[PDB]
Every structure is written in structure tokens, then in C-alpha cells.
Ligand binder design. Structure first.
Ligand SMILES: [K+]
Length: 404
């Protein structure tokens, strides 16, 4: 098996909280920690960690004979594509710096940087629209037929998150004027909101998913005592993040939402893995190429795993699609019979690897889970999906109206 091609779909790195609203301040008596960068901006530490990942992959790709040990990679050998958010553009710059330092590798973004990128947001940009009847039904089925059903299984994790927050002493909890229950699910009833370009949950679910991610972010960023020192063992970490992981299982991994949102990415990956005459398609980037790096969001990876049926969990990582988490796709050729095979994987730093700023390397690698396409009918011994089967899964998952 000769390794021929590699498409890495990565999440951005450790970033500042995206939002810092007055609801977040009102659910806890304690002050939220400041960050070194503006909201939603990648932090230097996040870049370095992403850089480590860039360095490990370089080594590993050398080892597989895909890249050259010494000096910068050949022209066109590496391609970086990144969404317009600073965090994603910086994450692309950070990866390059680690994969091949001091080489001038361009990070290719959408020209108008203040517009969404259709390749990362085909719904918010007009390419296609979710169907309300089918998307709501399907989300409600996944919830177990109702949102009440869903949030009923969440009371344990809300109890733990209420504790970490010190919710009873919170400005909101005093709803309780001088007759109303303090309970977090009862103060913020969750509500499924589906439209043509967006599906969301308003209430404790959306906010629990956000604050647990902030906790997790504080951990990877090295900040002293995340959760105000109220998170103390991995059990508590896994119980909190259950809320984040669970709000992505429902919204992002529903296929009637995942197939649509992810079709431009499916079409990009598809075109980067197929042996084909050289082609400068999107972002001025010629495909196919050796290593293609795509810097996106947790939603892009969730959508891909829902549409492709790649279900995974990251031992040592409470966040299922953590900062810098990578869905790696590789085309290997079998020399015996000259056939193309596809292999998928989740590469990642464990939360302790982020909080120790551990330097990755061949001998200090990151977590890595090997995935298999549920639907693939043509596997090798290694459990790789044939290029034909993988192509056929993609064509079945993709939603043509949502292609760029
Ligand atoms: K406001």
C-alpha cells in the first residue's frame, strides 16, 4: 500500500469564547476569565498546538514517503484552504508553520473575507435550503420523538453544570422574585427552531453546549482553574461535555441537515482524492495534490461524519470534535493489483496534551482513531474503503442542489 493523497479536514484551534453575553454572566455569580484575544479569535497557544499537529503530520508524511525530509515541499505539493473566520485563517497559517516552517505556503480563503464562504456555509449563502417538515421530523425523531424526551436525558449533566456554575447564587436563579423554580431547564426552556438556512435550539441546551465548550477551552488554553476550580476529575469533564457532544449529535449529525451542509466539502474532498489530470479548480488551488489542508469548524466535521456515517469518540478528549481535531482522508494504492483505497481517521490532541502544550512528533504522537464507513461494501483487510465504494457513498450522501 503506497500512500498517494491526503485531505485533512481540521477544526480551528484553541480560541477565545465566541460570545460573552449578559445571559452567560447572569447564570453564575462568578466572573468569567478574560482571554488574550478578541472574541472568536484564535489564541497564540492555539496556533502553537495546531503547529505541533503540523509538525507531526510532516514527519508522518515523510515516513510514508509522501513529502521530502529536507527543505520546503515542492510547489503545489501542499495546499491550505481556510474559512474566512480569523481563527480558521490563522489555524491554516499555524499548520503551515509547523508542517514546513519559514516556507511561504499560501492560505487560500474566499476573497471577500467579510462574507460567508459557501464551501463552509452553503445554507447561509443561498446555495440550498433545509426543508422544515423533513428536518424537524428527523431532528425530533433523533431526540426520541420530542425535545422534552431529549432534555429529559440531560438533567444529570445540567445538575453537574449547575454545580460548576454555582447557579443557586446566580442573578437569574433568583426568579424567585419575592414564585418560580430555579432549575436551569425551567428557566431556559429549549426550543427547536428550524428555517431554510439554519436549525437551532434556544435555551439551556444551546447555552449548556456553549459554556461547557468555554470550560474545555479554558483547559486547553492553560488557564489556571477552569470552571472556577469546580471541575476536578475526568468524570466531571465527561459529564459536562456530554451536553456539547449531545447538541451536536442532534443538530449537526442529523443527515437531513448534515448531507446538505457538507455537500460542498464532500465535493471538495472527492475531487482531491481522485486521480485526475491537474486542475486549478477552487481558490486557485490545483488538484489533485499531495496534502490538502482545510481549516473549518466543529460543524463541518460533525456534518461530514453524519453524512458519511463516521461515528467516533476521542479517548482522552471530552470534546468529540475538539479544537484542531482532524478528519484525515487518505488514498492508498495497492501495488500488488494497482487499486485505489480510502482510509479515514480522527487525529487529535488529548485535553492533557493541550494543557501541557505537549510537543507532537513521531515518538510523541496525538490521539488517533481509525474510522470506517458504515455503508462501505468493499473493504480491504486493513478495513479501508475501495475508491469505488467511497465514491459511491459520497454520491449517495451528497445533495446535488447543494453543490457549488
Ligand atoms: K446587546
Amino acid at each position: 500500500l503506497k500512500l498517494e493523497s491526503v485531505v485533512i479536514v481540521s477544526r480551528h484551534g484553541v480560541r477565545a469564547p465566541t460570545k460573552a453575553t449578559q445571559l452567560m454572566q447572569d447564570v453564575t455569580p462568578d466572573a468569567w476569565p478574560t482571554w488574550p484575544v478578541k472574541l472568536g479569535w484564535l489564541t497564540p497557544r492555539g496556533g502553537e498546538l495546531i503547529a505541533y499537529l503540523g509538525h507531526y503530520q510532516r514527519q508522518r508524511l515523510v515516513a510514508d514517503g509522501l513529502l521530502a525530509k529536507k527543505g520546503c515541499p515542492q510547489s503545489g505539493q501542499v495546499a491550505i484552504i481556510a474559512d474566512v473566520d480569523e481563527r480558521t485563517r490563522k489555524t491554516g497559517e499555524a499548520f503551515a508553520a509547523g508542517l514546513a516552517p519559514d516556507c511561504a505556503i499560501t492560505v487560500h480563503t474566499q476573497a471577500d473575507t467579510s462574507s460567508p464562504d459557501p464551501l463552509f456555509n452553503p445554507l447561509k449563502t443561498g446555495v440550498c435550503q433545509l426543508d422544515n417538515a423533513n428536518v424537524t421530523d428527523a431532528i425530533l425523531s433523533r431526540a426520541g420523538g420530542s425535545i422534552a424526551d431529549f432534555t429529559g436525558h440531560r438533567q444529570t449533566a445540567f445538575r453537574e453544570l449547575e454545580r460548576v456554575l454555582n447557579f443557586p447564587q446566580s442573578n437569574l436563579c433568583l426568579k424567585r422574585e419575592k414564585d418560580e423554580s430555579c432549575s436551569l431547564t425551567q428557566a431556559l426552556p429549549s426550543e427547536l427552531k428550524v428555517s431554510a438556512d439554519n436549525v437551532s435550539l434556544t435555551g439551556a441546551v444551546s447555552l449548556a453546549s456553549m459554556l461547557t465548550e468555554i470550560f474545555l477551552l479554558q483547559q486547553a488554553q492553560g488557564m489556571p482553574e477552569p470552571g472556577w476550580g469546580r471541575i476536578t476529575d475526568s468524570h466531571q469533564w465527561n459529564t459536562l461535555l456530554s451536553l456539547h457532544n449531545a447538541q451536536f449529535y442532534l443538530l449537526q449529525r442529523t443527515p437531513e441537515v448534515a448531507r446538505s451542509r457538507a455537500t460542498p466539502l464532500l465535493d471538495l474532498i472527492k475531487t482531491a482524492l481522485t486521480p485526475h489530470p491537474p486542475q486549478k479548480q477552487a481558490y486557485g488551488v490545483t488538484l489533485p495534490t499531495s496534502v490538502l489542508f482545510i481549516a473549518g469548524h466543529e460543524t463541518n466535521l460533525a456534518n461530514l461524519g453524519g453524512a458519511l456515517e463516521l461515528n467516533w469518540t476521542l479517548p482522552g478528549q471530552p470534546d468529540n470534535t475538539p479544537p484542531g481535531g482532524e478528519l484525515v482522508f487518505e488514498r492508498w494504492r495497492r501495488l500488488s493489483d494497482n487499486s485505489q483505497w480510502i482510509q479515514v481517521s480522527l487525529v487529535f490532541q488529548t485535553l492533557q496534551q493541550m494543557r501541557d502544550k505537549t510537543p507532537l512528533s513521531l515518538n510523541t504522537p496525538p490521539g488517533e482513531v481509525k474510522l470506517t464507513l458504515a455503508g462501505c461494501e468493499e473493504r480491504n483487510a486493513q478495513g479501508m474503503c475501495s475508491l469505488a465504494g467511497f465514491t459511491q457513498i459520497v454520491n449517495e450522501a451528497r445533495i446535488p442542489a447543494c453543490s457549488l
